[PDB]
């Protein structure tokens, strides 16, 4: 094929082939001349050489081309690929109808939705647009449909509405760790060029917002859509395929907010008020006439699936904080109080999620997980946790323990120089005194800080 500008491009095989034919024709001529044995053999040598270099160069003297510095690529090389077969395997199968750009958070979105940028979908879903434009008769033909897509008037949005409704879309990230590196979602159009990902599943993708990009594929047929929505949908795969434990587990804001809410205090606003129900508690808190963390007696009815998933109402007095009562409101009637009754950390939250799945089932845990996300965000925001210079507390006896450790290591180095101690003994002594001193500093800061 000719390159632009007058230039030509040719395979190395063509030049090798050409030389092959040339030498063969010369051999034909040489035969017609009745050439001596020595020269006929040399020509047969050259022929054998050329042929075998042509098939697979590399078992000979490495017969490159004229002046082009790189060794010529033989027939074998064209097939034999790294890694794996050239055309069938990596790299790498390019596919149409795909896009790639940066992911962005988007707190208000629900578990099964995603922000899908405007201009991408405009380009991608072109034929769906054209088809429905012409079938509904909003546009006379596909050519006029093309001019009308390229202007981008009100008409485009209705067709966009109809395709994006029943389309499910796939999000992909290059480190395909497991099958959940691609999940199916319902796309929701948003302004901008940034993809919105649901926060909870960021942990599964191991994604962070520092310029990472994700890929977005379009299942085109109805069957693909079905397979995506049924088998590949995010909401269907909450459980890790590896172990039974959760994959879509809390990331960070959630636990922090919950901690603010779940944490108990000696005394705050409205210590020792006795409430006949949770909603009054929450009403009191929202007015700032009560703190979220305060030990309190609340009248709450736990419900139990003792029957075939029915409600087994037990109705009396619980002693908890305000915060756990409010969260327990959100909590569906099938969870035992016991679960929220405790400290609630990452441990407890994950076990809670797990137990919720096993006893309650799929949908309560799904919806409740969404709930937990929003609540955690809310109370995290109201907590107002920050990081000041005084927040990193130098433990009271720091320099004492440091100077003691310093004087003792200096004493043990000088008594090393004295020659009652091998290298092993010295190593043991140094490492153990440092370990014990460091653990002392650790445990003293933890003691000092925890109950202050």
């Amino acid at each position: 094929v000719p390159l632009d500008g007058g230039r030509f491009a040719t395979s190395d095989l063509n030049d090798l082939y050409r030389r092959v034919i040339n030498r063969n024709n010369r051999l034909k001529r040489l035969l017609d001349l009745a050439a001596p044995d020595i020269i006929v053999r040399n020509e047969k040598r050259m022929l054998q050489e050329a042929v075998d270099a042509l098939l697979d160069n590399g078992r000979r003297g490495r017969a490159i081309t004229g002046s082009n510095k790189r060794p010529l690529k033989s027939l074998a090389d064209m097939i034999k690929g790294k890694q794996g077969r050239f055309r069938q395997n990596l790299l790498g199968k390019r596919v149409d109808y795909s896009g790639r750009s940066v992911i962005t958070v988007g707190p208000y979105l629900r578990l099964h939705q995603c922000g899908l940028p405007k201009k991408m979908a405009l380009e991608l879903f072109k034929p769906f647009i054209y088809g429905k434009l012409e079938l509904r008769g909003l546009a006379t033909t596909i050519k006029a449909a093309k001019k009308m897509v390229e202007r981008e008037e009100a008409v485009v949005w209705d067709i966009l509405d109809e395709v994006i409704r029943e389309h499910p879309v796939l999000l992909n990230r290059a480190p395909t760790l497991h099958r959940l590196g691609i999940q199916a979602f319902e796309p929701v159009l948003i302004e901008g060029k940034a993809i919105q990902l649901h926060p909870l599943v960021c942990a599964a993708y191991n994604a962070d917002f520092d310029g990472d990009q994700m890929a977005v594929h379009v299942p085109l047929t109805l069957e693909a859509q079905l397979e995506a929505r049924a088998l590949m949908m995010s909401t269907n795969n909450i459980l890790s395929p590896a172990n039974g434990e959760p994959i879509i587990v809390p990331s960070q804001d959630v636990v922090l907010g919950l901690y603010y809410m779940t944490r108990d205090c000696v005394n705050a606003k409205g210590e020792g008020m006795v409430l006949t129900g949770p909603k009054e508690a929450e009403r009191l808190y929202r007015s700032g006439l009560a703190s979220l963390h305060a030990r309190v007696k609340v009248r709450i009815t736990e419900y139990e699936k003792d029957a075939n998933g029915e409600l087994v109402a037990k109705t009396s007095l619980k002693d908890t904080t305000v915060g756990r009562a409010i969260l327990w409101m959100i909590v569906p009637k099938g969870l035992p109080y016991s679960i929220v009754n405790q400290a609630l950390g990452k441990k407890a939250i994950s076990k809670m999620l797990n137990t919720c799945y096993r006893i309650l089932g799929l949908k309560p845990t799904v919806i409740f997980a969404d709930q937990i996300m929003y609540t955690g965000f809310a109370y995290a925001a109201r907590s107002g946790a920050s990081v000041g210079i005084d927040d990193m507390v130098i433990p009271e006896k720091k320099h004492e323990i440091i100077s003691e450790a310093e004087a003792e290591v200096a004493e043990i180095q000088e008594q090393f120089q004295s020659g009652l101690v091998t290298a092993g003994e010295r190593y043991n002594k140094v490492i153990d005194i440092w370990a014990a001193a460091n653990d002392r500093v650790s445990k003293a800061m933890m003691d000092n800080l925890q109950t202050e």
Partner: peptide, 14 residues
Amino acid sequence: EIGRTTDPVRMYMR
């Protein structure tokens, strides 16, 4: 002793 010298130049020269 022949050390796999594939070069037809050398053989022919010989």
